[PDB]
A paper describes a structure:
Here we use a geometric deep-learning framework operating on protein surfaces that generates fingerprints to describe geometric and chemical features that are critical to drive protein–protein interactions. As a proof of principle, we computationally designed several de novo protein binders to engage four protein targets: SARS-CoV-2 spike, PD-1, PD-L1 and CTLA-4. Guided by these general principles of molecular recognition, we introduce a protein design approach based on the critical importance of the fully buried patches of the interface to drive protein interactions. Overall, our surface-centric approach captures the physical and chemical determinants of molecular recognition, enabling an approach for the de novo design of protein interactions and, more broadly, of artificial proteins with function.
To test our fingerprint-based approach, we sought to design binders to target the PD-1–PD-L1 interaction, which is central to the regulation of T cell activity in the immune system. We used MaSIF-site to find high-propensity protein-binding sites in PD-L1 and, unsurprisingly, the identified site overlapped significantly with the native binding site engaged by PD-1. This site is extremely flat at the structural level, ranking in the 99th percentile in terms of interface flatness (ranked 7 among 1,068 transient interfaces), one of the dominant structural features that makes this site hard to drug by small molecules. Two designs based on two different scaffolds showed low binding signals, which we refer to as DBL1_01 and DBL2_01. Combining mutations from both libraries, we obtained DBL1_03 with 11 mutations from the starting design, which was folded and monomeric in solution, and showed a binding affinity of 2 µM, comparable to that of PD-1 (KD = 8.2 µM). The SSM results revealed that the four hotspot residues placed by MaSIF-seed were crucial, as any other residue was deleterious for binding. To experimentally validate the binding mode, we co-crystallized the designs with PD-L1. Overall, for both designs, the structures showed excellent agreement with our computational models, with RMSDs of 0.8 Å and 2.0 Å for the overall backbone and 1.0 Å and 1.9 Å for the full atom interface for DBL1_03 and DBL2_02, respectively, showing a very high accuracy of the predictions in the interface region. The chemical composition of the designed interface is similar in both designs—around 59% of the surface area is hydrophobic and the remaining area is hydrophilic for DBL1_03 and correspondingly for DBL2_02. Whereas the native PD-1 uses a β-hairpin to engage the site, the designed binders do so through an α-helix motif, illustrating the ability of our approach to explore outside of the structural repertoire of native binding motifs.
Author numbering:
A (entry chain B): -4 to 119
B (entry chain A): 19 to 183, 188 to 225
């Protein structure tokens, strides 16, 4: 459920829209949502988890059955990091395996964020 | 800040157009610089209009020219999605997120009701010596339908019904009968799961 575009501005737009909408679904504090965006990801915080889950599924990085999808993460991180660092992100964050799906979402956000925080979009 | 919706479910005919609305509060003049309007279906982006600009690059190709935000009406706190030639993929749960000072979202349901409303009819004199005629009815819609033939006596006759198809069904029914002039027969398309009985008359 969501979108994937190919120009920084379209992406920044989709970033601000999906962030707002996932705050609306989850209820997450604005400050916690920023920390998520900023890299500061409390993996075990349930509101953090739900926001990670909403937002990764909106950008189709997790599919309906919580499966990590390389296509969607490429579409988002192509705009913040190089091609090879994208390849390395895919392979590193593919090993994340959690039967707790929200815990899985917060851990992927961790794993992605360690390559570049998503607030880096605000910096483009 | 509270986004609202006049109808929670739209029931719209296959091919006929569609406009689904989402209201939101506008006290003073509208400031397009601070408005965001996002429509999505399921696994599908429909409208992403942010800061005056409708992002055409994120809109799904299957909406890429059928759908559009009614920009004139935003100044009326009315975010209206319009969709031309409603197909069968267009059915499902939509969502409208608005952001203008605050932010809210609402969901709308859209069934594409295809009742077997345009019944076609044909009568063929198979045999003028035996008065054998062939009476046909042909209609099209999404829930499959059976066809029941009845003479003027309202006794049930037996006809041959062939059902084919992407998601819309085409149901052709034929009745061979030895009948005289001015006699009336009736082809009813029972749309089964949704009871939308429609009876066409053949004279
Ligand atoms: N005597 C009859 N009314 N026969 C109907 C045959 C219908 C045909 N087999 C079909 O289902 O496509």
């Amino acid at each position: 459920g969501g979108e994937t575009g190919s120009s920084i501005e379209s992406m920044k737009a989709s970033m601000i829209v999906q962030q707002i909408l996932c705050q609306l679904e989850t209820g997450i504090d604005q400050q916690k949502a920023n920390d998520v965006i900023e890299g500061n990801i409390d993996v075990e915080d349930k509101k953090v988890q739900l926001y990670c889950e909403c937002i990764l599924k909106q950008f189709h990085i997790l599919d309906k059955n919580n499966v990590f999808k390389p296509q969607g993460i490429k579409a988002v991180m192509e705009l913040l990091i190089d091609e090879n660092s994208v390849k390395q992100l895919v392979s590193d964050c593919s090993t994340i395996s959690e039967e707790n799906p929200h815990l899985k979402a917060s851990k992927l956000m961790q794993c992605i964020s360690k390559y570049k925080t998503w607030k880096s979009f605000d910096f483009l | 800040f509270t986004v609202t919706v006049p109808k929670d479910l739209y029931v719209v005919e296959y091919g006929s157009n569609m406009t689904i609305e989402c209201k939101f509060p506008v006290e003073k003049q509208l400031d397009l610089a601070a408005l965001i309007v996002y429509w999505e279906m399921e696994d599908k982006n429909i409208i992403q209009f942010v800061h005056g600009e409708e992002d055409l690059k994120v809109q799904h190709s299957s909406y890429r020219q059928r759908a559009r935000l009614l920009k004139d009406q935003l100044s009326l706190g009315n975010a209206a999605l319009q969709i031309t030639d409603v197909k069968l993929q267009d059915a499902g749960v939509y969502r409208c997120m608005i952001s203008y000072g605050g932010a809210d979202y609402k969901r709308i349901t859209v069934k594409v009701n295809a009742p077997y409303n345009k019944i076609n009819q044909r009568i063929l004199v198979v045999d003028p010596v035996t008065s054998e005629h062939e009476l046909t009815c042909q209609a099209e819609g999404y829930p499959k339908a059976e066809v029941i033939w009845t003479s003027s006596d309202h006794q049930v006759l037996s006809g041959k019904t062939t059902t084919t198809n992407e998601k819309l069904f085409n149901v052709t029914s034929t009745l061979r009968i030895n009948t005289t002039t001015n006699e009336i027969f009736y082809c009813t398309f029972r749309r089964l799961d949704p009871e939308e009985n429609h009876t066409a008359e053949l004279v």
